[PDB]
């Protein structure tokens, strides 16, 4: 999916995930992928 922010923690790109209306936030390379349902 792939959303605008930094992944900081894996967890914490939760909170702008649920902004994406996705399920989960996974860390990815540098940044926040969502999975969606």
Same mark, same amino acid.
């Given at each position: 999916v792939?959303?605008?922010? *930094?992944? *900081?923690?894996?967890?914490?790109c939760?909170?702008p995930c649920?902004?994406?209306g996705m399920?989960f936030?996974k860390?990815i390379?540098?940044?926040?992928?969502?999975?969606?349902?």
């Amino acid at each position: 999916v792939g959303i605008n922010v *930094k992944c *900081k923690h894996s967890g914490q790109c939760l909170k702008p995930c649920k902004k994406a209306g996705m399920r989960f936030g996974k860390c990815i390379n540098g940044k926040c992928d969502c999975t969606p349902k």
